[PDB]
Amino acid sequence: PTHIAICLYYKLGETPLPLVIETGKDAKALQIIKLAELYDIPVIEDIPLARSLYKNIHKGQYITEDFFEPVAQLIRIAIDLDY
């Protein structure tokens, strides 16, 4: 973790809460960001949020309460970004 990337997924009635589906540090983080550009997936920079998610919510885990509001804000941004 010079570089961190956290991939969040939310789909109604499927994921009960936002789900971390993938994470990466360093080269893998860089690759995730490059793949995001290729697939036009919204990417948002937030240093303390990225660190906290990386430390606390592992791949395949749902976010916990302390993350509800910041992640909810990210998802509201994302779903209309660059339309």
Binding site: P1, H3, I4, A5, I6, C7, L8, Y9, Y10, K11, P18, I21, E22, K28, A29, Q31, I32, I33, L35, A36, L38, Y39, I41, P42, V43, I44, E45, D46, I47, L49, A50, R51, L53, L74, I75, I77, A78, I79
Partner: peptide, 19 residues
């Protein structure tokens, strides 16, 4: 292979957060 499997996973993502 990682890259093609990472892509196949990643591509459904709603949002990616980075530092």
């Amino acid at each position: 292979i990682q890259s093609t499997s990472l892509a196949n996973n990643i591509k459904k993502s709603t949002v990616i957060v980075k530092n």
